């Protein structure tokens, strides 16, 4: 539903979806090759599957192709200023690709609508629902249109017949705390196969040791994991898979 949700919200709006309490496979998100840009700013694209986050946040919207280049911390514009923002400390990857033949309509579908003028600049990963008519000319606009009085937003026509920029490019942005909170989202953790009666290094759930793995009779308590011995020598192990 981050990527595969059919109809994303328009650009003035967006959805902050917390992603936590799960394991996050970035590989297919990395390996799908259906995404125009897989764009990481402060993290390693292939090391995601190895990297674990407490927080993750996905924000899914629609921008002009030429605006795809505009999103990057340090890169301002009509976007970063008004409709939606970038953190200047922003760290995380960015994934953009076109929805064109899906989201575009031959009539220049006016759902996707970008903020025209709201003077301020949003805070990182924030919006404003303001419909208030912008005031350019110092003469009071009275919350309506008039001389130098602008609707705060502006509505993209997306035609499938548009040039590159003016087609819709769905952009979902990621987020995280990394560690420093109780960790929830991690990348998948790749188990190997098993070998018995052959001296092997091994790792189990993070337990690391080396020995001769063998089947044993002794029974555990279902919540218990390791074994030990008198000498605190990690001994039995319950096979996690």
């Amino acid at each position, epitope marked *: 539903e981050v990527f595969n949700a059919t109809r994303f919200a328009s650009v003035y709006a967006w959805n902050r979806k917390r992603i936590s309490n799960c394991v996050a496979d970035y590989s297919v998100l990395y390996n799908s090759a259906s995404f125009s840009t897989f764009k990481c700013y402060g993290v390693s694209p292939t090391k995601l599957n190895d990297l674990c986050f407490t927080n993750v946040y996905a924000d899914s919207f629609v921008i002009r192709g030429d605006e795809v280049r505009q999103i990057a911390p340090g890169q301002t514009g009509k976007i970063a200023d008004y409709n939606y923002k970038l953190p200047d400390d922003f760290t995380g990857c960015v994934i953009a690709w076109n929805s064109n*033949n899906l989201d575009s309509k031959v009539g220049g579908n006016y759902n996707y609508l970008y903020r025209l003028f709201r003077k301020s600049n949003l805070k990182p990963f924030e919006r404003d629902i303001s419909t208030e008519i912008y005031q350019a000319g110092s003469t009071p606009c009275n919350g309506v249109e008039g001389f130098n009085c602008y609707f705060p937003l502006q509505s993209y026509g*997306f*035609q499938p017949t*548009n040039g590159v920029g003016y087609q819709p490019y769905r952009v979902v942005v990621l987020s995280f705390e990394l560690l420093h909170a109780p960790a929830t989202v991690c990348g998948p953790k790749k188990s190997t196969n098993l070998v018995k009666n052959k001296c092997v290094n091994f790792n189990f759930n993070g337990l690391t040791g080396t020995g001769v793995l063998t089947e044993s009779n002794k029974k555990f308590l279902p919540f218990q994991q390791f074994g030990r011995d008198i000498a605190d020598t990690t001994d039995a192990v319950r096979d996690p898979q």
Partner: antibody
Amino acid sequence: VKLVESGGGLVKPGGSLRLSCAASGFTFTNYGMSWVRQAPGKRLEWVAEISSGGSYTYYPDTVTGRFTISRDNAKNTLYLQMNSLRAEDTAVYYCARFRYGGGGTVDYWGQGTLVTVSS
Amino acid sequence: IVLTQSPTLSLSPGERATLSCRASESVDNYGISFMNWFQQKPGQAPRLLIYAASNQGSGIPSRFSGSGSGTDFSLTISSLEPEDFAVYFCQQSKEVPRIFGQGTKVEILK
């Protein structure tokens, strides 16, 4: 800027008439492309299509022109391979090129593809 | 949908050419600006004119001008020239294959 097309051809009704639209002076990907017909004694009929960053290739549905459309973006060449040929297909075909997004357009045009299907 | 145009005019040099692009069913745009203008010269490939009737610019000479209201689109070409007149067109948008106009050509006497 400039749309070069395939030359004339004369076939019988019912077959598949291939064409090619050679692009000179623009990026063929950045522009959704098309094949539009000006038929003898007729209005311009927008017929064949392809989009820029995707594959569109819709027609007037009606009786589908059905003409096979593909792209070689190395050649920058749009193809019109006209399925269900008929005598009415006699016309001057224009592979056209659109503008960047808006209320239109078709900016430039082919020089026309003379096409005659008859006995 | 389907549209109709002013088929022809017969006029003199240095005059306005009022060309109505009359759209059946859909009228212009929800975003208030649509249809188009196009020109195909006799013995010549078609050529862009205006889009949303209010618009385009350089590359389309200043004589080309006009607007449209709902169905009808008025292509107003001021100061006609006997060398400059040729069949004109207007594309639909927002519904149906965008098609074109039935063709529009302003004759010029003298």
